[PDB]
Symmetry: D2
Subunit: 122 residues, 4 copies
Amino acid sequence: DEAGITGTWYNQLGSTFIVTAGADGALTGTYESAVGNAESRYVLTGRYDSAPATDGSGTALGWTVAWKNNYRNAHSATTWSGQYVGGAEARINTQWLLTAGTTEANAWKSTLVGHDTFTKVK
Amino acid sequence: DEAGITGTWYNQLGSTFIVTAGADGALTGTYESAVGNAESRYVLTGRYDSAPATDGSGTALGWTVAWKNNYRNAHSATTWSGQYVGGAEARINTQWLLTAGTTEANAWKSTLVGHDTFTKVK
Amino acid sequence: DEAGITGTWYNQLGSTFIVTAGADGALTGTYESAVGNAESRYVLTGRYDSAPATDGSGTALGWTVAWKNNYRNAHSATTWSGQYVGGAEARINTQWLLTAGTTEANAWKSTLVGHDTFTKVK
Amino acid sequence: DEAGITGTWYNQLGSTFIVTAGADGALTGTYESAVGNAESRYVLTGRYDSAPATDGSGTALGWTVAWKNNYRNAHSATTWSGQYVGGAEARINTQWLLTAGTTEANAWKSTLVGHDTFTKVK
Ligand SMILES: [Ir+3]
Ligand SMILES: [Ir+3]
Ligand SMILES: [Ir+3]
Ligand SMILES: [Ir+3]
Ligand SMILES: [Ir+3]
Ligand SMILES: [Ir+3]
Ligand SMILES: [Ir+3]
Ligand SMILES: [Ir+3]
């Protein structure tokens, strides 16, 4: 799945996820969000299961973006957790957690949850 | 917070999180889970906000572990999203998503959610 | 939105959600899951915002099903949290948490997270 | 567990959860949040597993509050999903999803996630 995961992906929001999957389970690349307090590309790093089940199961993976780059700092980090499904309609189906830096008093409202589906076309 | 984050952390489950925070926002290290289909150390990578608010707010961060190493492959990945709070009782407060590789039919039950609190003592 | 919410809804899994919205914010009805350790109808109850923003915003709502009925007991409960969006393509977009009863030792793996989209056709 | 669940509970935020558990699996009561856009009591309804495992497992349950009452309308709903654990240090351990009513453009940031632990003392 190293071959299947590596490349450019697009989600339902119009965001662009560019990733290289290493032979070892490494994920590295950049993320550009179509929404939120974000501009241009942000570094991402993550991990994937580099020897997944050969019984038609998806390939577990995850990655993180910290929303600081040379343009902006949104004092937040998003992690996507999900699975890569290969084939003619390849998809990475994820759920994500976005945590903002907050005061201790506001910690209860620090974390957003959502889901993104990434495809090779878009 | 590069200085504050780098080091060994322990969660409420007895798991051990060893991390180095780079000047740039990189997180690298190893994770050893006290629970689940896990044995020994697993590679982790993530990101943190390397220029956080100076108004007492936490420092947003996240990381991923893919549960494959030389001992075991649990066909899953966990991402922790949260914030580092410094001081005498330093803490990393997180929520996490664990996605297992599944068939498409079982995708609805692919993802666990929980929360971990990490401290320097434990 | 009392009028818009009340009725039969179907999700992407083929599950059937039958609900009555009270003038007061009450939700009552039955849920039939197409998947999992479930058979036939289960009681549901919840709440909705009965005076939502008139600026095109969705209507916040939530409900719970405990997976015990006369046929089966799956020792679990699911809560859906989301919003109702009216119009020709009316939708209830949700994220859900399914907690199973567990021993204290297994509590870390007690809770599934996912998302369901409900429509009037299906 | 009907007997164990019924009563007044307090979370780590100082919020007050007053509930009656019906013989049938019904949960009814009021919630008063110590934090957020909330004042006084709000109606809650939910469900619990009224015949849980007798192997030391927790009792699955969930409930919803819509954040509208005679004082305020926060255009949001929270659902708590978790388990009741009985005994001398009885606890209801939950994870929750708070969805706000939003425009379709802002739906990606509509939902907060967190966790609450409720005890009989506090
Ligand atoms: Ir395998
Ligand atoms: Ir969605
Ligand atoms: Ir700042
Ligand atoms: Ir917990
Ligand atoms: Ir309003
Ligand atoms: Ir999905
Ligand atoms: Ir049982
Ligand atoms: Ir917390």
